[PDB]
Structure formats: structure tokens, C-alpha cells
Amino acid sequence: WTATSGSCKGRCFELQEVGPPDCRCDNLCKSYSSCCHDFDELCLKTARGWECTKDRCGEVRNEENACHCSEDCLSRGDCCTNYQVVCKGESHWVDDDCEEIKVPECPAGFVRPPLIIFSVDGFRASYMKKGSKVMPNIEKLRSCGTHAPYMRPVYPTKTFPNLYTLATGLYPESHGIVGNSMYDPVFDASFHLRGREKFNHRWWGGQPLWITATKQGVRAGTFFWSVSIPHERRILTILQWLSLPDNERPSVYAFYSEQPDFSGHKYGPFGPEMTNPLREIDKTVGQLMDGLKQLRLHRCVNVIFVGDHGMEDVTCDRTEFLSNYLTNVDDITLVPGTLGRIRAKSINNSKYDPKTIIAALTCKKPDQHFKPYMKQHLPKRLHYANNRRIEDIHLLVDRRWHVARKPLDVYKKCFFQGDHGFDNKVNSMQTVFVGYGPTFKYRTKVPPFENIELYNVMCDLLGLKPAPNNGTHGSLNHLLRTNTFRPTMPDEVSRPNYPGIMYLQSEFDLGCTCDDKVENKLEELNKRLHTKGSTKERHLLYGRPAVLYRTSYDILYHTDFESGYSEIFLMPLWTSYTISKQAEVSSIPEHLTNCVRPDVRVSPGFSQNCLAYKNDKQMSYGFLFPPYLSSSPEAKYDAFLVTNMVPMYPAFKRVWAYFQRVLVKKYASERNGVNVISGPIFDYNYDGLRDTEDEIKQYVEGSSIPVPTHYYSIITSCLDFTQPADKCDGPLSVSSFILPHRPDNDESCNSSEDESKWVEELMKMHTARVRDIEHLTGLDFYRKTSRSYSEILTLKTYLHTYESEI
Ligand SMILES: *[C@@H]1O[C@H](CO)[C@@H](O[C@@H]2O[C@H](CO)[C@@H](O[C@@H]3O[C@H](CO[C@H]4O[C@H](CO)[C@@H](O)[C@H](O[C@H]5O[C@H](CO)[C@@H](O)[C@H](O)[C@@H]5O[C@H]5O[C@H](CO)[C@@H](O)[C@H](O)[C@@H]5O)[C@@H]4O)[C@@H](O)[C@H](O[C@H]4O[C@H](CO)[C@@H](O)[C@H](O)[C@@H]4O[C@H]4O[C@H](CO)[C@@H](O)[C@H](O)[C@@H]4O)[C@@H]3O)[C@H](O)[C@H]2NC(C)=O)[C@H](O)[C@H]1NC(C)=O
Ligand SMILES: O=C(c1cnc(OCC(F)(F)F)c(C2CC2)c1)N1C[C@@H]2[C@H](C1)[C@H]1CN(C(=O)c3ccc4[nH]nnc4c3)C[C@@H]21
Ligand SMILES: [Ca+2]
Ligand SMILES: [Ca+2]
Ligand SMILES: [Cl-]
Ligand code: NA
Ligand code: NA
Ligand SMILES: [Zn+2]
């Protein structure tokens, strides 16, 4: 109930909410069916429009007008945004040359530069260049402020997940808004676009910027606006809030445009009907900046112009129907569109089987435009698994396509020409970032980054301490003139042991054999030095990774590679080696095909054994440092140590072998040497975080050899490729992957063909940030470089995406 009999007189766009049954006058009352009877009349005036005309100047104040051109309007804080231009001979903000804002220039009483978050729905990254002629205001912000060529949204590239990620710095899986539509089995409730359930606080996890601000004593404008409140009125409301007395006035504001998303859906990303919405958004920005200039705030306020995702061409004729694949199409519930999520229609159906559903959707048609996954098998970079609202079965839909259950659903529920939601690496889904103000840099271009990073920065801009989030704080310092956050390296938790030769060959009973009994103080002093780490400055370029958790492990040195060998997991946590441009690929000699050698520095009890692999009919093994890249026939013996060995399904050995024999060399050629760090990842609960040993669900049969869910590699070289990887004087260049360790290659529909037609495509799909590997291993890389820590944090958040140019 709401007793809508109260009045909004003096309460228009009040900042604190009132609880029913008192009627409301805040910018969300419409949405709650709760405004006072007189809201429209007092708060939503329209009389005479939004602009001063020549014959309104000096007018007698008339309260019925949407905005005023009267002489007392500046003091009352309610002039039309163009007042000074029409009536006081002023120029528009867009006509003024930009001049660096070296320090905030604010009125007395302003404790901090305010922040205005101007968010635009569906604003595709390429609009910055392609629409540039019709967006003079936005282009001024862009070229005079700090901008990125594009910003990477989170997956799914939908509205609520992205807007709430902007607000919290969290992945949807952590914030809980995992789509525009959800079922929560624990609540037994559904979240929809239309309806009252989405208003319930229980959907919304983490801590959005407005709450963070409020708790730390920074006052926040109410972020949201009911759809019917026109853009011009939202702008005038923010500007009014900005005239409030010091003690009442918020420091952080939000504006949201439904455009250009709304039109994009109807007309496609580049439909000729798209020019007008872009003009209109530019006009709104024009008004904001003109209104800031009026109040002397245009060199005080930090402005963020930010989109949530792009927009792609998508028509009804590009729809895949699950009814062309499943016989049982009525036993399932599908969340449809640009992603698919499937669950059983009924919990009381024990004949429902996800395994047979996936198989029925796997590589069934030649140009099939989606790919089924169990959620834990999705590329780790999407971070889309660790929430009970995300269904076990997911469909990654090709760009430009939809997935639906039955044809009836499409024609009884073509209209649309645009949609979004696809993989967050897709170019058409990329969106925009611009920061403009005293705290942002002047005329600075920064590299693409992910929207999860912004929460931290907005906290920095307001002097706030961010709640724990998925950003890497300091990784965006290069956007800021001041307010940078100076992080320190996490402290190493476990120090390594440096074992010497401690065991005799005969103490080992591992069922391994090697034809290594083929036998000089010249070459014996040499190999001693190698085992003590003589070549370590070659193979370990950035220092050893720090172990950030309590464990027991050994550093092992070799001519060609160095490892951190875990006595707990019986394999290295990491293996580091450098391949120079000149390096030579060689084969495993015939006599050594099945060679595994005990490591006389590591006890039998902390070693794997060959018997368990023999007995395990499903599981074979591979090596972290590849035998193919051994620097000499004698050095090759090192690569067969039981301590370089890791469990691999024969299916995955196909991927691994090709990576080690063909791809490392190719990258070394193209990048002028590469440093490689490779290792296992255990993420059995798919939380993105290193599993503890009691979380492992699979061992090589008969043993305590744990089976990785994934294998990673981090591939570093010199950004200036005229310098060899091992002699780099400046910034680095990185790409990484986290390959799922699967018993089949069902993921790649081409896998019965030669590795050269599918392996690299799969690796690219599973591209990763070094930071993703950090979370998954509890390791901290790049500890010893000559680079600043902020620059290294940026490097660690880099994602190599393999999309062409935007
Ligand atoms: C990205 O960033 C985020 C944010 O930093 C990272 O997420 C954090 O990771 C931590 C480790 O997983 C986790 O810490 C746990 O907290 C548990 C209680 O937490 C509550 O309070 C916090 C703080 O206010 C709150 O944020 C939480 O909110 C979650 O849940 C609510 C309600 O369901 C949601 O609305 C909200 O969206 C959020 O959901 C997400 O997180 C939860 C995990 O908490 C997931 O289950 C969801 O799917 C969703 O993704 C909570 O309200 C606490 O119970 C844990 O403590 C257990 O384990 C520790 C080990 O140290 C041990 O000391 C304790 O004994 C305890 O064990 C007991 O419970 C076990 C399991 O039930 C049981 O086996 C035992 O026998 C014991 O009984 C733990 O400390 C932290 O909550 C989240 N925070 C967020 C916001 O998600 C995330 O990891 C980052 N991602 C990457 C890739 O880096
Ligand atoms: O009011 C906020 C808000 C505005 N700003 C916000 O945050 C700004 C900030 F991130 F900067 F903080 C947030 C936060 C998510 C809560 C919400 N809104 C109002 C609209 C839009 C965001 C939501 C999504 N809706 C839709 O109808 C919709 C829109 C486009 C679509 N394309 N395809 N399907 C679509 C469905 C309903 C809601
Ligand atoms: Ca959107
Ligand atoms: Ca885990
Ligand atoms: Cl969704
Ligand atoms: Na085997
Ligand atoms: Na296959
Ligand atoms: Zn949309």
C-alpha cells in the first residue's frame, strides 16, 4: 500500500527515500507505483521546453516552466542549460578550445571534485570513430580527456550484468546478476525484465559504488531513473543537486541513456536510422557540459562516459532451433537468444540427462552456429560458472546468431535487426570509455581494458576504499593524473627448498625405465653448475614466481629450464624456460621414446611413478619442459625426469604435443625469442581459484597423483621485438592460455583432422590474462623486472584476444 495523498511540494527528486505508506518524490517512485498525486505537476514540468530563446532573457520567473531564463535562475540553480549562451553572450562548452585541467577548479565548499557517470546502453566502440562527425561534444571529451580505443564488457554482454559489474568491479558469477533473466533454485524465484521480483535486494550481491560511497561518508545522488523521465529532466535534476548546500550535496552522480541500444535492436548497429540517436546523446552531453560550465563546474567535475556493451547484426533468419537436434525438446527449459542456458523443465523428471543433451548438441551440423558446454568447461576468461543461477548446460552462440527452443517461439512471442550478449572478446560487443576531468590525464590514449577495473578507479576518484572486487587495483593508474593507488607486491608465503643430490637410483621403485646408461672433468664441472642454476638467468627472466599460500616445494635447476616442484601435488607448480629465435626443434630419439628417469634430488615418496600410468587405462602423461626443445642430446635427458612429468589424457596430448613441437618455435620466430612458464591448474569447484588438495576429484588410478583440470602457459617477450626476449630493456609483451584438460576433443569439431587445422583455434578460444592464472594457482609472476609495478599490473590484466582490428 501507498497512501499517495501526500505532496511533493519542496520534495521534487528528494535524495533519501520514504517508506510506504508515505508517498514518494524520488526519481524511482514511478517504477514503484508510489509517487505522490502531484509528482507530474510539480516535478515533471515541460512548459516551453528545454532551451532559452532570445525573448525569455530576464523574464519574470514563472514556476510552471520546465526551466528558467529569469535573472535569479543561476542562484536558484535552475536555468535551462543554454541560458548563459543565449542571454549572457557565452559560448557552448563544445566551442571552447580544450585547455589542460592541471588542478580542480571548484567553488568554495567543494571538498572533492564530484564524479558524473554518464552511461550509454549499447554504445558500440566503433561509434567513436564512425559517428565522430555527429558527436562534437563526445569527441571533445574523448580527444581532450583520457580515452581507450575500446573497453571489454563482461560475459554475457547483456545490460544488467554489465551495468552491475560497472557498479561493483565484480564478475556476474560473483555479483549474482548472471543474465537479464534468471532462476534461483534456492529461493525458488525468477528474475525478469518486467516485474517486481528484480526489485528484491536478494538478487544483488557485492557492494555497488553508491553503497560504498554512502558508508564512507561520501553522499550519492540516486543512480536510477524511471524510463518516462526524459533525458533533459535527468540532466536538470543532476545540475540542481549540484547547487544544493555543501552539507546536502552529493559527490557522485549517474546518468543513464537507453540509447543507442533501443534503436540498435530495431535497425542494427549501423542502420541509417542510427545517426539520429547518436546526435541526440551528443546533445544530452552538450547540455550537461553547458550546465556544468554555467555553474563554474566544468573544470572541477570528473566525467566518465562509459558504455555497457556493443551491438551486432542479428536477424530472425539467423536462428538455430533446439528442435532440430533434440527429440525431447519439451523436457527442457531454455533461456534463449545470444546465449543459451538449459535446465530440466521438471525436477521430478529422473529421465532428464545433461550428458545425452550435450551429445545431441555436439557438432551435429556442418556450419552449426552454437557450441554446447558444461559450464565448468567454458573458457576460464569468461569467469561464468560459480553461481547457482548459471545453468550446468550453456550454449556459446556465434556472433550474428540466435538460439531458440522451437520455431514457434520466434514467430509467436522479422522485427529485430540488432542484438548483443555474445562472447566478450567479440569486436561488435566492445564498448567505450572516456574520462575527462582534473583527476584524469590530458589528451591521453590508454590501451583497451576490462570494465571490471572501473570500480577501483571510481573509488580512487572519490577517495574511497573499494570493497573486495575482481579488478586489479593499480592496473589503471596510467589513466590518472593524481589519486593513484600505490600497491605493494604480495609477500611470498612459502619459501622454496633447494635440494641437492640426496637419493641413489636404486631407492626408487617407480616402474620407470630409461635407456640412459650410455656414458671428463671438462663436461662434468659444466653439468654440476647447470644443476646449481648456472643458466638460471637465461630461463628465469622475471624472477621466480612467489608462492602465496602455505605449501612445501623445491626449486629444481636444469640446463634448459627451471621448475618449482610441489611435494604436495607431485608435479611442478610452474616450469620456466626461454626459447630464443635461433633455437632448434629436434625429435625425441627412438631409444628414448618411453624414457622416464628418477630425480635424485627428490625422494621416491614425493615422486610420481610409471606403474600408475601403466595401470590407468584412461590416463597417459606429458612433460612441462618439452623434450623437443632440449639444447643438446645430453641436456635432453633432463626433460625425461619424473619431476618434469604431468598427467595427460591421450586426447589432450594431441593438443600439448602440437603446442610444444610446432607453436613454441613459431612464437619464438615471430616474437624474437619467448620465455615460457607452463604448469597445471586444479579448479574442480570451478571458482576461478586454486583448489586445495582436499578439493581434487580425480587421481591417476592407484596413486596420489592429482589430475589437473587445466594446463596454462604464460608466453613473454620484448614489446620492442628488435630486442631478443632475454635482453629486453623496456616494456614486455605477453600472451597466455588456460587449456582445459579434457579426455576428448569434442569441443573442436575438426579434431579428426591434422592438429594444424584445430589446435591453435582452440588455444585462442582459451586465451587468458596472467592474472586469471594467478587466481587459479596462487602464484605471483613478474616479481623481478626493471618495470614499474603499475605497468606490470596492466601487463597482468592484458588479454590477447585474436580479433582483428576494431
Ligand atoms: C572476484 O571477487 C570476489 C569478491 O572478493 C571473490 O569472491 C569472494 O571469495 C571468497 C572465497 O570464495 C568468499 O569468502 C567466503 O565468504 C563466505 C561468507 O561470505 C558472505 O559475506 C560476504 C561479505 O559481505 C558476501 O559478499 C557473500 O556474498 C555471497 O553470497 C551472497 C548470498 O548467497 C550473494 O548475494 C553474493 O552475490 C555472494 O555470492 C557469491 O559468492 C558466494 C561465496 O560466498 C558463492 O557461493 C556464490 O555462488 C556467489 O558467487 C556472503 O554473504 C564464507 O562462508 C566462506 O568461509 C568458508 O570457507 C573459509 C575458508 O577460508 C573457512 O574459514 C570457513 O570455515 C567457511 O567454511 C564453512 O562453509 C563451507 C562452505 O559452505 C563449508 O564447507 C565448511 O564446512 C564451513 O561451514 C568464505 O570465507 C567471498 O564471500 C566472496 N565474495 C563475493 C562477493 O563473491 C571472488 O573469488 C573473485 N573471483 C576471482 C576469480 O578472483
Ligand atoms: O536504471 C537502470 C540502471 C542504470 N544505471 C545503472 O548503473 C549505472 C552504473 F553502472 F554506472 F552504476 C544500473 C545498475 C545495474 C543496476 C541500472 N536501467 C533501466 C533499464 C536498464 C538499466 C535495465 C535493463 N532493462 C531493460 O528494459 C533492457 C534494456 C536494454 C536491453 N537490451 N536487451 N535487452 C534489454 C533490456 C530494464 C532496466
Ligand atoms: Ca545494455
Ligand atoms: Ca577452486
Ligand atoms: Cl540472459
Ligand atoms: Na595409461
Ligand atoms: Na572433435
Ligand atoms: Zn540491448
Side-chain angles (χ1 to χ4, degrees), residues 1-412 414-518 520-806:
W1 188 256
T2 306
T4 61
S5 48
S7 170
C8 281
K9 159 185 124 64
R11 295 168 61 188
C12 282
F13 303 108
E14 63 190 26
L15 281 163
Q16 303 173 345
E17 185 197 304
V18 275
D22 328 321
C23 57
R24 292 167 54 178
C25 308
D26 58 283
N27 57 2
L28 266 178
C29 65
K30 287 282 190 204
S31 298
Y32 277 86
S33 289
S34 73
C35 309
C36 299
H37 61 264
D38 60 1
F39 181 80
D40 288 307
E41 172 194 354
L42 302 178
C43 309
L44 295 176
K45 294 158 181 144
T46 37
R48 307 258 250 147
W50 311 111
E51 315 182 14
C52 291
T53 45
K54 288 155 185 167
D55 55 295
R56 278 191 72 179
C57 304
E59 73 182 12
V60 178
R61 166 163 289 270
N62 179 345
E63 303 287 18
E64 283 185 325
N65 294 338
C67 50
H68 314 282
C69 311
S70 71
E71 202 60 18
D72 77 319
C73 75
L74 278 156
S75 359
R76 285 280 287 270
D78 59 12
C79 312
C80 303
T81 62
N82 76 337
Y83 169 72
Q84 278 186 175
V85 172
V86 187
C87 307
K88 296 286 152 301
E90 271 293 4
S91 60
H92 287 284
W93 174 84
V94 66
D95 297 313
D96 298 336
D97 290 335
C98 66
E99 313 279 346
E100 191 174 358
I101 319 164
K102 291 190 193 160
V103 295
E105 301 166 18
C106 301
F110 279 84
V111 51
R112 65 184 60 82
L115 171 68
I116 301 169
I117 307 157
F118 191 114
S119 69
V120 284
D121 196 357
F123 205 100
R124 183 164 172 167
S126 44
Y127 292 159
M128 287 308 258
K129 170 141 95 154
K130 299 171 79 66
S132 69
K133 262 94 170 170
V134 308
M135 311 183 294
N137 288 279
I138 289 161
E139 188 45 57
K140 190 185 171 185
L141 289 180
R142 179 195 155 280
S143 62
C144 293
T146 301
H147 81 286
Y150 55 95
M151 187 180 65
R152 188 172 308 122
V154 287
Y155 183 81
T157 49
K158 291 283 194 177
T159 305
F160 269 127
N162 276 284
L163 291 181
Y164 202 58
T165 282
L166 282 157
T168 56
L170 293 161
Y171 300 119
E173 79 177 352
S174 292
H175 71 53
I177 307 299
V178 306
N180 282 337
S181 160
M182 319 167 260
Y183 175 72
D184 181 298
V186 168
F187 299 159
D188 175 44
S190 312
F191 172 117
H192 314 287
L193 293 160
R194 300 301 160 169
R196 317 200 54 66
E197 184 55 36
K198 73 171 192 296
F199 289 106
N200 199 314
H201 282 201
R202 62 185 184 167
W203 299 95
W204 307 84
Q207 188 198 98
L209 183 65
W210 56 91
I211 297 295
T212 303
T214 291
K215 292 190 176 221
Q216 288 175 51
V218 178
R219 200 160 34 266
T222 30
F223 268 38
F224 319 144
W225 313 84
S226 295
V227 257
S228 47
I229 298 143
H231 287 205
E232 299 87 352
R233 173 55 65 201
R234 294 175 205 193
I235 298 300
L236 285 158
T237 305
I238 285 160
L239 294 169
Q240 190 76 74
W241 283 339
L242 281 162
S243 303
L244 287 167
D246 296 332
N247 62 301
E248 290 167 23
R249 173 184 71 241
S251 281
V252 62
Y253 305 88
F255 171 89
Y256 168 83
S257 172
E258 303 80 355
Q259 285 289 33
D261 182 81
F262 187 63
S263 291
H265 280 286
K266 303 173 100 311
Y267 308 111
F270 309 109
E273 309 82 344
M274 295 303 299
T275 295
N276 284 347
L278 291 179
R279 294 189 181 282
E280 287 309 277
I281 300 154
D282 197 74
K283 184 168 175 157
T284 293
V285 168
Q287 297 180 357
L288 178 50
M289 299 310 301
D290 282 345
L292 292 181
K293 179 175 182 177
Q294 268 186 189
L295 313 172
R296 301 163 292 117
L297 284 166
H298 65 297
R299 295 177 52 89
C300 169
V301 165
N302 293 299
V303 175
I304 288 179
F305 187 83
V306 64
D308 56 1
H309 51 67
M311 181 77 69
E312 176 62 278
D313 298 283
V314 176
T315 61
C316 301
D317 68 302
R318 297 199 293 273
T319 311
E320 287 269 4
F321 298 94
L322 295 195
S323 54
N324 296 333
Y325 301 77
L326 307 172
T327 49
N328 59 278
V329 92
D330 293 288
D331 282 345
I332 73 157
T333 292
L334 174 74
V335 184
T338 51
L339 49 155
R341 322 200 301 275
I342 299 158
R343 61 189 187 282
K345 172 138 212 171
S346 170
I347 36 140
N348 296 118
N349 173 26
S350 53
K351 244 124 281 155
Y352 174 87
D353 195 339
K355 292 126 127 295
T356 69
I357 289 172
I358 301 267
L361 300 168
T362 297
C363 309
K364 274 316 147 59
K365 307 277 133 65
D367 292 329
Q368 177 171 336
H369 306 272
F370 67 81
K371 184 185 292 317
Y373 280 89
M374 288 290 303
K375 60 177 188 169
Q376 72 276 5
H377 293 150
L378 289 161
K380 302 299 278 184
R381 57 179 171 82
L382 300 172
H383 295 284
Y384 198 68
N386 189 205
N387 196 279
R388 70 206 182 199
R389 304 163 190 173
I390 293 164
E391 283 82 358
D392 294 347
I393 305 175
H394 198 80
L395 316 187
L396 264 195
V397 179
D398 287 0
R399 73 195 66 188
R400 300 167 47 88
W401 286 74
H402 277 169
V403 68
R405 212 173 49 103
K406 291 197 267 191
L408 88 70
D409 293 340
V410 158
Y411 67 84
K412 292 259 267 182
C414 180
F415 330 90
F416 55 85
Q417 280 187 285
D419 208 0
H420 47 84
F422 307 108
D423 193 327
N424 69 332
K425 81 174 163 94
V426 174
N427 278 347
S428 61
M429 297 301 89
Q430 301 315 286
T431 185
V432 290
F433 178 81
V434 175
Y436 178 96
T439 318
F440 290 104
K441 285 181 172 163
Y442 176 65
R443 308 187 168 272
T444 302
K445 188 217 187 77
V446 300
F449 62 89
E450 304 187 333
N451 70 348
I452 59 159
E453 297 311 325
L454 272 182
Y455 175 71
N456 288 333
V457 167
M458 296 182 298
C459 287
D460 291 339
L461 293 194
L462 295 164
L464 295 178
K465 189 206 166 157
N469 69 94
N470 305 129
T472 293
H473 204 174
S475 76
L476 296 197
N477 284 345
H478 60 288
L479 277 61
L480 307 175
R481 168 188 306 271
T482 71
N483 284 18
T484 54
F485 164 92
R486 288 307 172 185
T488 57
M489 287 184 176
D491 298 319
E492 175 143 38
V493 175
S494 302
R495 76 154 134 279
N497 305 293
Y498 295 91
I501 299 173
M502 293 169 58
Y503 303 93
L504 296 177
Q505 164 95 49
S506 50
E507 299 182 66
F508 294 79
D509 181 7
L510 310 175
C512 301
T513 64
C514 185
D515 185 62
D516 62 337
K517 334 229 159 202
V518 208
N520 205 33
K521 301 140 225 158
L522 322 174
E523 288 207 323
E524 269 157 75
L525 201 21
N526 235 140
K527 59 207 300 294
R528 275 170 242 177
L529 299 173
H530 287 335
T531 300
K532 319 267 172 138
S534 79
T535 44
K536 79 176 141 153
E537 349 291 336
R538 201 188 131 62
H539 302 300
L540 200 77
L541 289 188
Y542 322 110
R544 72 172 164 75
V547 178
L548 306 195
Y549 62 96
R550 176 76 262 151
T551 196
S552 176
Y553 81 102
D554 310 305
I555 297 305
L556 309 173
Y557 298 119
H558 316 79
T559 314
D560 293 349
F561 69 100
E562 169 173 345
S563 63
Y565 180 87
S566 172
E567 283 181 350
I568 307 308
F569 286 73
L570 307 183
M571 64 193 64
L573 300 173
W574 54 262
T575 302
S576 179
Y577 61 100
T578 301
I579 303 310
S580 78
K581 181 174 187 162
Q582 290 70 47
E584 184 88 18
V585 177
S586 58
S587 64
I588 300 174
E590 292 176 51
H591 69 285
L592 295 170
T593 313
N594 292 320
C595 165
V596 180
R597 311 164 63 243
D599 184 349
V600 304
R601 306 161 292 186
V602 185
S603 90
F606 297 130
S607 296
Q608 288 167 52
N609 71 86
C610 297
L611 184 51
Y613 289 104
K614 187 158 193 304
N615 296 344
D616 194 317
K617 294 295 177 256
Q618 316 301 308
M619 189 59 66
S620 171
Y621 66 80
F623 295 108
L624 287 175
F625 175 81
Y628 327 101
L629 303 177
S630 67
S631 67
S632 70
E634 200 203 313
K636 200 182 293 284
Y637 287 100
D638 294 349
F640 293 114
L641 287 169
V642 67
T643 50
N644 184 33
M645 183 181 53
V646 287
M648 297 187 175
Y649 289 117
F652 189 85
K653 285 167 68 33
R654 291 185 63 197
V655 176
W656 199 245
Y658 187 83
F659 159 64
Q660 296 190 313
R661 190 183 52 91
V662 182
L663 300 185
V664 177
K665 190 50 222 160
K666 191 188 98 180
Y667 307 153
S669 295
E670 297 176 354
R671 304 166 55 169
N672 194 359
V674 288
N675 178 255
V676 180
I677 305 179
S678 285
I681 280 162
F682 311 83
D683 195 22
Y684 280 100
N685 59 358
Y686 49 84
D687 66 350
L689 307 173
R690 177 195 54 98
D691 287 353
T692 49
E693 176 217 300
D694 71 358
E695 259 145 19
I696 308 304
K697 290 156 85 35
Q698 210 210 322
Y699 292 83
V700 184
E701 182 182 318
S703 79
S704 291
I705 312 167
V707 172
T709 51
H710 297 84
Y711 285 100
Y712 73 86
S713 289
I714 297 164
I715 303 172
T716 313
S717 57
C718 196
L719 185 61
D720 175 8
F721 49 88
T722 68
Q723 297 188 337
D726 57 10
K727 285 181 193 54
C728 179
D729 296 321
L732 307 172
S733 171
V734 66
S735 53
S736 311
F737 58 75
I738 301 168
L739 284 171
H741 179 221
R742 287 175 63 172
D744 63 71
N745 288 306
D746 297 349
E747 176 168 6
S748 322
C749 299
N750 272 26
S751 59
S752 63
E753 284 164 50
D754 181 66
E755 283 84 9
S756 82
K757 323 285 188 170
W758 62 274
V759 164
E760 206 172 9
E761 178 205 5
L762 168 74
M763 284 169 61
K764 285 187 189 168
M765 195 53 67
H766 294 277
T767 190
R769 308 170 312 146
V770 164
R771 197 77 191 98
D772 294 324
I773 292 161
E774 289 187 337
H775 288 319
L776 283 160
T777 64
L779 300 170
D780 190 59
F781 300 99
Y782 300 128
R783 309 273 296 175
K784 311 289 183 152
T785 73
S786 58
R787 315 305 303 163
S788 86
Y789 186 41
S790 273
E791 169 193 315
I792 292 300
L793 295 174
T794 309
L795 189 68
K796 287 181 176 190
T797 64
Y798 174 85
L799 185 65
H800 194 125
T801 60
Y802 302 105
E803 293 285 300
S804 54
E805 285 187 44
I806 298 256

